[PDB]
Amino acid sequence: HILILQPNKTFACQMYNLLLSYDEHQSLELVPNHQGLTPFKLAGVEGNTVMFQHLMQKRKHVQWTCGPLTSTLYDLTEIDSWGEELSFLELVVSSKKREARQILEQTPVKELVSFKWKKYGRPYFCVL
Amino acid sequence: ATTVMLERKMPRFLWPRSGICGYEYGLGDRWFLRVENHHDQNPLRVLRYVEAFKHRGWEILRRNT
Amino acid sequence: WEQYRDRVNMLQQERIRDSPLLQAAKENDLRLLKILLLNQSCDFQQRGAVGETALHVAALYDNLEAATLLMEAAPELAKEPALCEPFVGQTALHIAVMNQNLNLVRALLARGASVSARATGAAFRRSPHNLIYYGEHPLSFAACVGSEEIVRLLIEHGADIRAQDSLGNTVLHILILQPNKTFACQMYNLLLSYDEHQSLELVPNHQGLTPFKLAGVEGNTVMFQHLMQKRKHVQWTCGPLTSTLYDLTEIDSWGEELSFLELVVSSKKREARQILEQTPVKELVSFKWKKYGRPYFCVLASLYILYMICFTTCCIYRPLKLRDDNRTDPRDITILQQKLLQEAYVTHQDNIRLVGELVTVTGAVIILLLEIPDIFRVGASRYFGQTILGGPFHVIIITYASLVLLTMVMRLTNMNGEVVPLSFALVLGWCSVMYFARGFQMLGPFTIMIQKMIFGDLMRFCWLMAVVILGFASAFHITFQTEDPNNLGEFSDYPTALFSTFELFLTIIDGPANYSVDLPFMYCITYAAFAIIATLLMLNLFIAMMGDTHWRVAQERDELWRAQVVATTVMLERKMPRFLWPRSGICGYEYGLGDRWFLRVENHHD
Amino acid sequence: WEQYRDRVNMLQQERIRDSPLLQAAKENDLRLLKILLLNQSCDFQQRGAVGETALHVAALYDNLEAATLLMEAAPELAKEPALCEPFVGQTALHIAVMNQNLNLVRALLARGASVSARATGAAFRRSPHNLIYYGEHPLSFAACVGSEEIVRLLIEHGADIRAQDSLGNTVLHILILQPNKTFACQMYNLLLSYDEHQSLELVPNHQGLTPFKLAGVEGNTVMFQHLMQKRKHVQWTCGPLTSTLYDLTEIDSWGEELSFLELVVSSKKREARQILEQTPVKELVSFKWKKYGRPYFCVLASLYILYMICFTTCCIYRPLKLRDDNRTDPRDITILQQKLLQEAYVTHQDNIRLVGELVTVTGAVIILLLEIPDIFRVGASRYFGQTILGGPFHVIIITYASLVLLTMVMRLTNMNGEVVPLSFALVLGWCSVMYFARGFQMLGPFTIMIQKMIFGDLMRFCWLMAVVILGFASAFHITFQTEDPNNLGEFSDYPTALFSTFELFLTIIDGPANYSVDLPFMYCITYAAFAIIATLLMLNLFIAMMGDTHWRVAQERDELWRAQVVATTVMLERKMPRFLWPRSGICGYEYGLGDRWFLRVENHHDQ
Amino acid sequence: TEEQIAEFKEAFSLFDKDGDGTITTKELGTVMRSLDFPEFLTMMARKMEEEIREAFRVFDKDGNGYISAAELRHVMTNLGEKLTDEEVDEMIREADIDGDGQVNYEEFVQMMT
Ligand SMILES: [Ca+2]
Ligand SMILES: [Ca+2]
Ligand SMILES: [Ca+2]
């Protein structure tokens, strides 16, 4: 949590991945604070997008390369939190800090919410 | 924000939850998103690293420094 | 669609997860692969369950050693394309060409996999769904990947340069349809050198488009001028300067039906307006407009103005009569009446009015007889959207001609209410002149600026205007529905009230008050609220946003107008007869060159 | 013309293609050239159809060994000029100069061709048809191409520097008339050193232009300051600073009618307008304006202000008369009447207004007498050209003076309609103040922005206006003809409806309405459509286009207004009597320097 | 240093095809035909002003070591001089040598000097 709360450094992110390597073991990442915040959600509401995509690095899985183009898949498990009451996305968009609006432009989430809009939200909004 | 508001408040009957049911594909209870990209192949970024492996605003920006 | 594509891709990954033969193939676990090859009962005809083969898998994962171990037991799979639905003609040759592994390609040719095997899958298609289009035959893949030695080897082992595709494409076409590289120019010159010889450049596509015309419509201008360099002929240098000449033979195509120039200027792609800035066509259109086009356009517009004023004075002296009946009614003033047609045609003044009307209708019919067969040639939706061609100016004039045709029919049936379509067609014919306002230099870009602007943000002002006045007009009609209309005015019923608010929003009419009589308590507050929210608030925002938009498009509109004038030029040279249009060029048959027109040009170098 | 050049070039190239001797010449077919030279019977004096030497062809294509074989065979072809219409005196000498083959030039001079031959063809002309002009001489061509050793060899073999072409081109003049090269300064210095002698710079052209005046009217300010470097004279340096002095004798143009500085400001080129920024001239015009120009301008402005008021109060008291007849008619108001002449002048007040009119007319006639002889001296189309001069300002004061001269005769003839020229002359003569705005510092560039803008985009708005407003006026007259005109107003007939649309277009008059009586059903839609296209749409677009062009233009007017004041200054000091204008300069004849006027100037700077 | 290792971070990601965190010879082999990260950081370490470093740090808003056009436009609007958006892209075309739509410290310092 305090590695998140920092002027953002890949220099610090090496220490982050280092301490994650020194995690020698339940999952340590699943800890909330007194406010109930996982460091995933803390980084999301903080929007340190370098730290966010480094957090996203192990979330990837590639599938195949094909000359100049390459397919992959993401795990959208922790990004949804539909089972929770506090969704990740509303937690992002409801914030006092400004630059959290930048984390909307991440390569997992952008096309996802755009697709979910253009299939669903625009006809319902127009008919309403 | 408008989207996630209406998608919180409207009932679930109109909406299958998005994602890819990997349990159908034996991945099991975790939903995914496949995406691809075509990139360019700039040689110059590769050349030096593999080799190691072997005008108005510009003036004022100089004045601001 | 795309969802179907990703679903069947994930199912393909399931099927590659299924069989341990293919799984050990993509893993390259050659110790276990020796066990599988030692197994007789391991069937080697087992293909990928969704339409692929094991050699395709080894070609994907580049496990060439495993591929060599596969090729002894089943070399016939090297010659086999598989039966997937988007991937129906695909062979491992295409993947090996793509991944640039010359030893793998050489081993495939060692088994003798046929180069002439062509691959036309559903994903192998020019599509917005498809991200990359690379052509059909493996030569196209070798060209777009740019491997020199591979396509050299293909030449050595077959692979005819004359290659005909679905949509009639050739290697030249897919070289044109390409994100531009200077390396593509080298590949182009290479295969042009390896061409033996009619000439291969002469062939069009299935649509009937030569690669010269394809390069013209696509505007890869480096490739364009580089292709022009072969036709460039220099004559002599002296001192600082150099006289050269060009063969303008293929650039005119006056003998053809569809010229190069009308092809280029009629395109949905934007960057083609840049390609007219190349030197020989620039000099050509400059010479051609400067010699003839501007006086013809001036005299045509002059005769149109002379038609319009005669139409106007025809519209002045309509035959009228005193109103016969009595009104029996205050708030009723209607003192005039139409004449009958037998009543009208009575005087010498009526005779000259009638011959002026005859002039108007015989000028009306020729507009239809001019432009109606032009509409069937091109797509009408393509015809109206092109602001460079003046499609919206064509929108007005056909309605003008229709209404002026209709009003005479309304007259001949003794039908009333012709004043309304006359009032329509009058102002439409007067606003018709802005098409002909193009021709001046000072006048040109201004009207296409305002034509951009009226489509630009006028609706953004208009919709908000409608809803806010729909609020306040109803508020005013409620707050004035109790008292004497003889003193208040404008708010008798709702339809005059909304029009009153429309008049008084724009500040055209002064605010309503009588200071003799008394006034209700709320209207002060409501009217002041309307005044602050409407008059100065966002009217000024319209000014500011207008200024920013003009500030941004101030660069682009001149670039548009330069294309607009030569579009006008090629239009008028299409429709005018040819004795008014002599041949622009240099008949080299006079000079023994023979049946070709050239253009000499010079300058000193910089 | 330009088209004819294409035909003659291609026909010449065809005749190049025709002669196989010329084919082997242009292609250096030296085996076949020895074969053709083995033929005695071959004519070797073959010339092209436009008239050319085979040596000219070989010099064009630099086949110099074939040229040596030809001069060995026939040297007499080397001394032949071209007989072309565009090329009436062209030799291989000019070609070998411009293509710079020094050994070939040495071979040409080895045969001894005359350097002083004159190639004065039609394409050798300062023309927009011609690309780059240089003049005639081979010396000029060696100078403009900048080869030292060629023109050194020319000096070694005669080739006198003192020469002249058509229009008085001398070598220094055409060196000035060049695009900027660093080598031009060096070659200028070289030929200046090689001049050995009145001086050679003293000669003007046929037009009467010394090369210093040519550099002034062109404004090649690097060449100007390098020429001025000789005119500089340092006096002393000490510490970080340096006092020096300049000779302003050359910059004066004292005894001439053709003054230098007015010749500078009377130019079409903008870049010569830059040359005011040089160090002697800026100090001189600043000193001369500051000591004399501003108060002399202000006193004359005050006098003209006082002159306008007498004409004003003269125009106030016209002789009037009660109307004799009876109009007997509604829409007829003619209650006053013009007064007769002999009826008028009877009081002391009549004498007052009479002498007040006499002041105006005697001012007007001397305005004419001052204005007229300026026109014949200068180009009249030029006189109305430059806004620095204020030509269109001069037009309206000419017309004002003309009308106020004219209006006396209608009184002298007792002609009716006396107000008709008078009101026009009044409103035009009040606009005669805008020239004086350039005298004030804060007021100067503002009115030239206005004068730029009224020619700039006002016509773009005006030509768009008339069509749309005419169509709507026609629609309004053929929607209000059905109705009683007393109750509607503004639309009785066609001219008043046409004018009424112009009235309420620019919101001068509130929109027409009636409460007691109803309206035509069609009128609402028409007027609403006119309102939405009219007010907020295109007027506001004119505002935005005004604002966009304001920022883009707004820089240059400052330099332009600073350019205006010195033309104002020289025109002011030129026409005044001489005792009000003393001699600027420093009379060093008192000081043993002798009859020359200098200017001391110093500058602290960094080292 | 931190922008320097930001260059090697995306470089190592360009070498790492499967994204496993290593560079194998097969990943190296696919590079040659087109012609760990602390292992890569150590290997490139032997191969390798204050105000400029201070200038870049206030410029790069997110601290990714790469200034975008929108970051530049936000600085250009913070400068106070009006410019349209096309010439801002030309400014990227002026500085981006290898063509990534980005500028590093090294493309920045060659522009300033
Ligand atoms: Ca790896
Ligand atoms: Ca950034
Ligand atoms: Ca870069």
Nearest to C25 by CA among C3, C1, C50, C46: C46
Partner A contacted by B34 (CB < 8 A): yes
At residue D83, φ and ψ (nearest 5 deg) are -105, 30
Cα D463 → chain centroid: 27
Partner E contacted by B57 (CB < 8 A): yes
Reported structure resolution in angstroms: 4.4
Question: What DSSP state is assigned to residue C83?
Answer: -
What b/e readout covers C225-241, taking b as 16+ CB neighbours within 10 angstroms?
Answer: eebbeeeeeebbbebee
Q: Is E62 annotated as a binding-site member? A: yes
At residue C204, the 3 state secondary structure works out as: coil
Q: Three-state SS across C41-58?
A: CCCCCCCECCCECHHHHH
Q: Which domain holds residue D147?
A: 1-227
User: Is E30 within 8 Å of C99 when comparing Cβ atoms?
Assistant: yes
Residue with tokens 């014919």: C429
CA distance C189 to C226: 10
Ligand nearest to the CA of E102: 3
Q: How far apart are the first and last CA of chain B?
A: 41
Give the alpha-carbon dihedral of D323, D328, D332, D336, to 10 degrees: 10
CA distance D164 to D168: 6
CA distance D314 to D363: 13
- B1, B10, B36 member nearest A71 (Cβ): B36
For the sheet with D598-604, list strands across it: D232-238, D241-247, D598-604
Strand partners, D602: D243
Q: Token digits for D52?
A: 């050319």
At residue D90, φ and ψ (nearest 5 deg) are -75, 135
Strand partners, A65: A70
Nearest to C142 by CA among C105, C109, C112, C111: C105
Q: What is each CA distance from C505 to C159, C468, C513, in whole angstroms?
A: 75, 10, 16
At residue D58, φ and ψ (nearest 5 deg) are -65, -30
Alpha carbon of A74: minimum distance to chain E alpha carbons (Å): 13
Cα A117 → chain centroid: 19
Q: What is each CA distance from D469 to C443, C575, D495, in whole angstroms?
A: 18, 32, 13
Nearest chain A residue (CA) to C131: A69
Question: How many angstroms separate the alpha carbon of residue D424 from the centre of ligand 3?
Answer: 69
User: Is E76 within 8 Å of B65 when comparing Cβ atoms?
Assistant: no
CA distance A105 to B18: 19
Nearest chain A residue (CA) to E61: A99
Report DSSP letters for C278-296, one per residue. SHHHHHHHHHHIIIIIHHH
User: Is C99 within 8 Å of A67 when comparing Cβ atoms?
Assistant: yes
Strand partners, C602: C243
At residue C74, the 3 state secondary structure works out as: coil
Nearest chain A residue (CA) to B17: A82
Strand partners, A32: none
D265 and D217 Cβ atoms separated by less than 8 Å: no
D566 and D262 Cβ atoms separated by less than 8 Å: no
CA distance C220 to C353: 59
Q: Token digits for C353?
A: 């009015």
CA distance C349 to C346: 8
Alpha carbon of D182: minimum distance to chain C alpha carbons (Å): 15
Residue with tokens 């087109």: E34
CA angle at D415 for the pair D410 and D421, rounded to the nearest 5°: 50
Residue with tokens 């209410």: C417
CA distance C493 to C499: 10
- A63, A69, A76 member nearest B37 (Cβ): A69
Residue with tokens 């011959």: C355
- Taking 3-state DSSP, the helix, strand and coil percentages for chain D, each rounded to the nearest 5, stand at 60, 5, 35
CA angle at D391 for the pair D390 and D393, rounded to the nearest 5°: 65
Alpha carbon of A111: minimum distance to chain C alpha carbons (Å): 14
Burial of D222 (0-12, 13-18, 19+ CB in 10 A): exposed
User: Is B1 within 8 Å of A93 when comparing Cβ atoms?
Assistant: yes
**What are the residues whose beta carbons fall under 8 Å from the beta carbon of D74, sequence distance 6 or more?**
D44, D45
C95 interaction partners in chain A (CB closer than 8 Å): 66
Question: How many angstroms separate the alpha carbon of residue D119 from the centre of ligand 3?
Answer: 58
Q: What is each CA distance from A98 to A102, A104, B21, C20, C145, in whole angstroms?
A: 8, 12, 35, 52, 45
Q: What is the CA radius of gyration of chain B?
A: 25
Quick count: other Cβ atoms within 10 Å of Cβ D196?
6
Q: What is each CA distance from C562 to C111, C567, C568, D300, D519, in whole angstroms?
A: 59, 9, 10, 51, 48
CA distance D169 to D203: 10
What contacts 24+ positions apart, CB below 8 Å, involve C407-413? C408/C361, C411/C341, C412/C341
Q: Where does D99-183 show beta strands of DSSP type E?
A: none
Burial of D586 (0-12, 13-18, 19+ CB in 10 A): middle
On the CB side of D417, how many CA atoms lie within 13 Å of its CA?
4
Partner C contacted by A67 (CB < 8 A): yes
At residue C138, the 3 state secondary structure works out as: helix
User: Is A76 within 8 Å of B10 when comparing Cβ atoms?
Assistant: no
- E18, E19, E64 member nearest A50 (Cβ): E64
Question: How many angstroms separate the alpha carbon of residue B40 from the centre of ligand 3?
Answer: 14
At residue C136, the 3 state secondary structure works out as: coil
Nearest chain E residue (CA) to A50: E64
Cα C244 → chain centroid: 35
Amino acid at D305: I
CA distance D105 to D94: 10
CA distance C560 to E39: 56
**What are the residues whose beta carbons fall under 8 Å from the beta carbon of D261, sequence distance 6 or more?**
D251, D253, D281, D566, D570
Report DSSP letters for D34-55, one per residue. HHHHH-SSS-S----SS---HH
Question: How many angstroms separate the alpha carbon of residue D145 from the centre of ligand 3?
Answer: 44
User: Is A7 within 8 Å of E62 when comparing Cβ atoms?
Assistant: no
Partner A contacted by E9 (CB < 8 A): yes
Partner D contacted by C427 (CB < 8 A): yes
Q: How far apart are the first and last CA of chain A?
A: 42
CA distance C148 to C190: 9
What b/e readout covers B34-48, taking b as 16+ CB neighbours within 10 angstroms?
Answer: bebeeeeeeeebbee
CA distance C511 to C501: 10
Superfamily of domain E49-112: EF-hand (1.10.238.10)
C507 and C471 Cβ atoms separated by less than 8 Å: no
On the CB side of D139, how many CA atoms lie within 13 Å of its CA?
27
C572 and C262 Cβ atoms separated by less than 8 Å: no
D163 and D202 Cβ atoms separated by less than 8 Å: no
D136 and D123 Cβ atoms separated by less than 8 Å: no
Query: Chains touching chain D at 3 or more Cβ pairs under 8 angstroms?
Result: C
Strand partners, D599: D246
Instruction: Determine the residue among B13, B17, B18, B23 to mutate to test chain A binding: the one whose Cβ has the most chain A Cβ atoms within 10 Å.
Output: B18
Partner E contacted by A16 (CB < 8 A): no
Q: Token digits for D170?
A: 């001398």
- E31, E79, E111 member nearest B58 (Cβ): E111
What contacts 24+ positions apart, CB below 8 Å, involve C185-190? C185/C222, C185/C223, C185/C226, C187/C143, C187/C146, C187/C148, C188/C223, C188/C226, C190/C148
Ligand nearest to the CA of E39: 1
CA distance C151 to C148: 6
D43 and D70 Cβ atoms separated by less than 8 Å: no
CA distance A40 to A29: 8
Alpha carbon of E64: minimum distance to chain A alpha carbons (Å): 7
User: Is A11 within 8 Å of E17 when comparing Cβ atoms?
Assistant: no
Q: Is E16 annotated as a binding-site member? A: yes
Question: How many angstroms separate the alpha carbon of residue A49 from the centre of ligand 1?
Answer: 24
D67 and D55 Cβ atoms separated by less than 8 Å: yes
User: Is C235 within 8 Å of D13 when comparing Cβ atoms?
Assistant: yes
* Chains A and D, touching by 3 or more CB pairs within 8 angstroms: no
CA distance E65 to E4: 8
Q: What is each CA distance from D369 to C122, C438, D573, in whole angstroms?
A: 92, 47, 18
Question: How many angstroms separate the alpha carbon of residue E53 from the centre of ligand 3?
Answer: 17
Quick count: other Cβ atoms within 10 Å of Cβ C301?
16
Instruction: Determine the residue among D540, D542, D551, D553 to mutate to test chain C binding: the one whose Cβ has the most chain C Cβ atoms within 10 Å.
Output: D540
Q: How many CB pairs under 8 A join B and C?
A: 13
Burial of B20 (0-12, 13-18, 19+ CB in 10 A): buried
CA distance D558 to D189: 36
- B1, B15, B31 member nearest A76 (Cβ): B31
User: Is C552 within 8 Å of E84 when comparing Cβ atoms?
Assistant: yes
CA distance D136 to D346: 79
User: Is A77 within 8 Å of B31 when comparing Cβ atoms?
Assistant: yes
Partner C contacted by D470 (CB < 8 A): yes
Q: Which fold has domain E1-48?
A: Recoverin; domain 1 (1.10.238)
A50 interaction partners in chain E (CB closer than 8 Å): 62-64
CA distance A20 to A68: 33
Q: What is the CATH number of the domain that holds C20?
A: 1.25.40.20
At residue D384, the 3 state secondary structure works out as: coil
Q: How far apart are the first and last CA of chain E?
A: 20
**What are the residues whose beta carbons fall under 8 Å from the beta carbon of C129, sequence distance 6 or more?**
C1, C2, C5
Ligand nearest to the CA of E12: 1
Number of helical H runs and strand E runs in chain C: 30, 5
Task: Please indicate the experimental technique that yielded this structure.
Answer: cryo-EM
What b/e readout covers E42-79, taking b as 16+ CB neighbours within 10 angstroms?
Answer: eebeeeeeeeeeebbeeebebbbbbbbeeebbebbeee
User: Is C131 within 8 Å of B34 when comparing Cβ atoms?
Assistant: no
Q: What is each CA distance from E49 to A11, D105, E4, E54, E62, in whole angstroms?
A: 20, 58, 14, 9, 21
Instruction: Determine the residue among A20, A62, A98 to mutate to test chain E binding: the one whose Cβ has the most chain E Cβ atoms within 10 Å.
Output: A62
What b/e readout covers A82-119, taking b as 16+ CB neighbours within 10 angstroms?
Answer: eeeeebbbebbbebeeeebeebeebebbeebbeeeeee
* H or E element at residue A114: helix A109-116
At residue D76, the 3 state secondary structure works out as: helix
At residue D168, φ and ψ (nearest 5 deg) are 75, 30
At residue D57, the 3 state secondary structure works out as: helix
Question: What DSSP state is assigned to residue C555?
Answer: T
D59 and D96 Cβ atoms separated by less than 8 Å: yes
Strand partners, D324: none
CA distance A4 to A40: 9
CA distance C146 to C180: 12
CA distance B39 to C53: 27
A67 interaction partners in chain C (CB closer than 8 Å): 98-99, 145
CA distance E60 to E3: 10
* H or E element at residue A64: strand A60-66
Burial of D328 (0-12, 13-18, 19+ CB in 10 A): exposed
Query: Chains touching chain E at 3 or more Cβ pairs under 8 angstroms?
Result: A, B, C
Alpha carbon of C215: minimum distance to chain B alpha carbons (Å): 23
